[PDB]
Amino acid sequence: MAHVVILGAGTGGMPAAYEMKEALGSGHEVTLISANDYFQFVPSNPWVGVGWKERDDIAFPIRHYVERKGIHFIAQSAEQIDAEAQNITLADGNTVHYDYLMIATGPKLAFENVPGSDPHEGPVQSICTVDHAERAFAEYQALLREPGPIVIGAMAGASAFGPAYEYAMIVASDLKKRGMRDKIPSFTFITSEPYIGHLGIQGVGDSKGILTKGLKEEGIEAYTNCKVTKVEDNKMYVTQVDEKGETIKEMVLPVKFGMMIPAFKGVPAVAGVEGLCNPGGFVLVDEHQRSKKYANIFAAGIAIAIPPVETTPVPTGAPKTGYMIESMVSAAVHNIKADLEGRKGEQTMGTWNAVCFADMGDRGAAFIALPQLKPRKVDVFAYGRWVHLAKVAFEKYFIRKMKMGVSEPFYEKVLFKM
Ligand SMILES: Cc1cc2nc3c(=O)[nH]c(=O)nc-3n(C[C@H](O)[C@H](O)[C@H](O)COP(=O)(O)OP(=O)(O)OC[C@H]3O[C@@H](n4cnc5c(N)ncnc54)[C@H](O)[C@@H]3O)c2cc1C
Ligand SMILES: CCCCCCCCCCCCO[C@@H]1O[C@H](CO)[C@H](O[C@H]2O[C@@H](CO)[C@H](O)[C@H](O)[C@H]2O)[C@@H](O)[C@H]1O
Ligand SMILES: [S]
Ligand SMILES: [S]
C-alpha cells in the first residue's frame, strides 16, 4: 500500500529511513532520496577542517546499507515538490510520487546573504559540509605556507555558534602544535551574538565567562553584535551595532584565512512549496511534526520552523541539535504509522533542548540546556576529558548505527546507567 518518501539522508533523514521501514514493514514502500550518495557525520566537519579527521573517517556510501534493509535509495536532488499532485521532480527530470513525505533536508547555507562570502568566491571558508571542510583545510595549508590574518566566527542570522568556537579553538591549537602560532599577524573572532557564549540560546552555565577567557587565552580578539555586509578584495566589511540596532562601528579586516558560519535557510525545493514554509523556508509543523498545510507531509531536523524566543540586536537563530532532532524523527515515524493505521499519532518531540559537544583534543566543552526559555530546568556548560570520550564514542556509535540499522529509541546510550 502506502509509499513513504524520506527526503534527505542526513542526521535526521538517515535514521528516519531505517526507523520508517522498521515500523511499517514489508507491506509498505520506503524510499530515501538525497542529493549525495554518501552519508557524512556533520559534527566531525570542524576537525576535518583542521586536518584532524579525513573524509574517509566520517563519510560512507549509503546504498548498500539501506537497500539491505529493504529501503529504496535515489541519489538524486529533489528540485521541485508538487504537494497537490504529491510528485517530486528529481534533478534528472524523473518524478517520484509519494503518499507520505517526510522532509529532512537540513539547511540551505545562505552565503548569498553576504556577497563574496561563498567559499568559492573569496577567502571566507566553511566547515558545514565535508566538501567545504576539505576546502577549508586546503586553504588553511595555504595560510601555513604564507601566514596572514585569520578571521573566524558566525554571520548574522547564524544558529550554529558552537562550531564557530570549536573551529577557532582547534585552529589555535593546531597552529601551536605546528610552532606556527606566533607567525600569525592577527587572529580575530567575529560574531552576531550579543555577547560571547550567547550561543543562540541566551547563554548556558558559564559559557560566557569560559569562552571569553578561552579566546583571550589563545590571543584571539573578539567582537560581538557584528554583521558582515560583504567580503570583497580579501577584506571582510563588518558593521557592529548597539542594543538598539544603531551602528557603533565599521571595520575593514583583511583575511588570508577565514571561516564564518553562515545563516541557514530552508532548501529551495522545500521553500518553494507554496504555503508550506515560513519566510525563511522552514517547514511549519505542529507538535506532532506534521505540516500545518499538508496532512501527508511531515518534517524533522533543521528543516522545521522553530519560532525565535529572543530578538537580538543582530539577527541570530537558536540551534537545532542532534538529540532533539532524533526526537522529532521518532515522533514523525510513529505518527505516520498511526495514520497508516487509523489513529492520529499523539507523539511529540517533547521538551525543547539544545545539547552540543565540542572536542578540543583530549578534553572538550559540552552544554545541555532545557527548555528554551529561562529559568531553565537544566542549564549546564561543562569542560573535561569526559566530553572528549563522549564525542569520540558518539561518532563511532552513530556511524556504526547508520551502517547496521536503527530499530529503536536511538539513545540506549542511557544504558551506561543500568
Ligand atoms: C559544523 C556543524 C557542527 C555541528 N555539530 C553538532 C554537534 O556536535 N552536536 C549536535 O547535536 N548537533 C551538531 N550540529 C547540528 C545538527 O545536529 C547538524 O546540523 C545535523 O546534521 C542536522 O541534521 P539534519 O538531518 O536536519 O540536516 P543534515 O544532516 O544537513 O541533512 C540534510 C540532508 O538532506 C539533503 N538534501 C538537502 N536538500 C536536498 C534536496 N533538495 N534533495 C535531496 N536531498 C537534499 C542533504 O544533502 C543532506 O543529506 C552541527 C552542525 C554543524 C553545521
Ligand atoms: C560545546 C558547546 C560550546 C562550543 C565551544 C567549544 C570551544 C571550547 C573551548 C573553551 C575552553 C576554555 O578553556 C578552559 O576552561 C576550563 C573550565 O573553566 C579549563 O579547566 C578548568 O575547569 C576544570 C573542569 O571543568 C578543569 O578540570 C581544570 O583543571 C580547570 O582549570 C581551563 O583550564 C581552560 O583551559
Ligand atoms: S540550526
Ligand atoms: S553544536
Side-chain angles (χ1 to χ4, degrees), residues 277-401:
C277 299
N278 66 14
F282 295 98
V283 181
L284 292 155
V285 298
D286 65 17
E287 78 187 0
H288 312 278
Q289 310 301 139
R290 186 188 310 258
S291 148
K292 294 219 196 195
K293 182 158 298 301
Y294 295 105
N296 57 183
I297 297 176
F298 288 70
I302 282 175
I304 76 149
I306 298 182
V309 290
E310 192 194 10
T311 177
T312 50
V314 176
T316 62
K320 304 160 181 156
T321 57
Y323 172 84
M324 190 183 217
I325 289 173
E326 177 51 33
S327 177
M328 294 185 204
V329 168
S330 185
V333 172
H334 179 97
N335 294 151
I336 289 158
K337 183 180 172 141
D339 261 41
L340 287 176
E341 292 173 12
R343 310 93 53 166
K344 192 196 88 164
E346 280 301 341
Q347 183 173 158
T348 79
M349 70 166 186
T351 302
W352 184 100
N353 60 265
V355 177
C356 180
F357 282 62
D359 201 341
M360 294 300 95
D362 359 59
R363 47 212 61 176
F367 69 68
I368 297 173
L370 75 295
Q372 193 171 11
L373 278 174
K374 296 171 176 193
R376 283 174 176 145
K377 282 162 152 26
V378 178
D379 190 68
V380 172
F381 183 96
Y383 183 89
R385 266 202 294 171
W386 77 272
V387 172
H388 160 244
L389 298 194
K391 187 82 180 209
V392 167
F394 186 68
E395 177 186 28
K396 192 191 187 313
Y397 178 71
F398 203 96
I399 287 181
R400 192 176 72 109
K401 210 137 203 69

Side-chain angles (χ1 to χ4, degrees), residues 36-55:
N36 301 151
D37 66 9
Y38 63 94
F39 169 89
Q40 62 183 277
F41 187 72
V42 168
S44 288
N45 275 326
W47 277 40
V48 177
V50 80
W52 289 9
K53 285 275 191 44
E54 309 256 317
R55 169 185 297 257

Side-chain angles (χ1 to χ4, degrees), residues 1-6 20 24 27-31 33 81-88 95-103 290-291 294-298 335-337 339-340:
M1 253 283 110
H3 186 209
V4 190
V5 173
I6 291 105
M20 195 71 68
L24 268 31
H28 292 99
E29 188 178 8
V30 176
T31 301
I33 304 180
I81 300 173
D82 181 337
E84 300 276 322
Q86 297 169 206
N87 282 334
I88 299 165
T95 132
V96 180
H97 174 92
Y98 66 83
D99 295 301
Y100 284 88
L101 165 61
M102 186 189 298
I103 298 172
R290 186 188 310 258
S291 148
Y294 295 105
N296 57 183
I297 297 176
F298 288 70
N335 294 151
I336 289 158
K337 183 180 172 141
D339 261 41
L340 287 176

Side-chain angles (χ1 to χ4, degrees), residues 170-189:
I170 59 178
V171 165
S173 170
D174 192 74
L175 252 4
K176 275 145 65 189
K177 211 188 319 290
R178 290 182 183 254
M180 198 75 281
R181 182 65 188 85
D182 56 64
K183 265 80 164 308
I184 298 310
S186 60
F187 193 153
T188 146
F189 192 78

Side-chain angles (χ1 to χ4, degrees), residues 90-359:
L90 301 173
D92 69 10
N94 263 4
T95 132
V96 180
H97 174 92
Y98 66 83
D99 295 301
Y100 284 88
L101 165 61
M102 186 189 298
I103 298 172
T105 44
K108 184 202 179 175
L109 307 177
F111 300 111
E112 75 265 6
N113 288 358
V114 185
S117 80
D118 188 282
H120 294 279
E121 69 196 357
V124 184
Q125 295 306 290
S126 150
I127 54 73
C128 293
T129 68
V130 67
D131 275 358
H132 286 185
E134 280 181 332
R135 201 181 162 77
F137 184 56
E139 177 169 311
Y140 176 69
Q141 276 164 329
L143 173 74
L144 263 20
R145 300 186 210 102
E146 321 194 349
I150 294 175
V151 185
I152 294 171
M155 293 308 200
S159 46
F161 295 95
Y165 291 96
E166 175 181 354
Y167 196 59
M169 293 304 281
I170 59 178
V171 165
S173 170
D174 192 74
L175 252 4
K176 275 145 65 189
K177 211 188 319 290
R178 290 182 183 254
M180 198 75 281
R181 182 65 188 85
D182 56 64
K183 265 80 164 308
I184 298 310
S186 60
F187 193 153
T188 146
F189 192 78
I190 297 299
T191 180
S192 52
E193 288 167 285
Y195 55 86
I196 294 295
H198 176 283
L199 293 163
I201 54 174
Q202 297 74 52
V204 54
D206 195 17
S207 67
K208 185 184 172 203
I210 288 168
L211 272 32
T212 289
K213 152 174 254 184
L215 293 172
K216 187 194 167 82
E217 222 152 51
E218 301 303 323
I220 301 170
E221 202 173 51
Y223 300 85
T224 54
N225 280 313
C226 288
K227 55 184 147 88
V228 187
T229 48
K230 71 175 171 202
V231 179
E232 189 178 67
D233 309 315
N234 305 286
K235 297 183 291 188
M236 188 184 300
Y237 290 72
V238 177
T239 295
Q240 188 185 33
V241 297
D242 61 356
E243 303 161 321
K244 310 292 293 302
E246 244 52 31
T247 297
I248 53 146
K249 54 168 177 280
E250 307 186 343
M251 301 185 293
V252 193
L253 302 171
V255 188
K256 170 69 182 198
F257 179 62
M259 198 294 297
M260 295 290 287
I261 298 292
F264 299 159
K265 293 173 172 180
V267 305
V270 167
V273 183
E274 186 188 0
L276 183 66
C277 299
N278 66 14
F282 295 98
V283 181
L284 292 155
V285 298
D286 65 17
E287 78 187 0
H288 312 278
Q289 310 301 139
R290 186 188 310 258
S291 148
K292 294 219 196 195
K293 182 158 298 301
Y294 295 105
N296 57 183
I297 297 176
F298 288 70
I302 282 175
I304 76 149
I306 298 182
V309 290
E310 192 194 10
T311 177
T312 50
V314 176
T316 62
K320 304 160 181 156
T321 57
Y323 172 84
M324 190 183 217
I325 289 173
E326 177 51 33
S327 177
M328 294 185 204
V329 168
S330 185
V333 172
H334 179 97
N335 294 151
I336 289 158
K337 183 180 172 141
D339 261 41
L340 287 176
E341 292 173 12
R343 310 93 53 166
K344 192 196 88 164
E346 280 301 341
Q347 183 173 158
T348 79
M349 70 166 186
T351 302
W352 184 100
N353 60 265
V355 177
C356 180
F357 282 62
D359 201 341

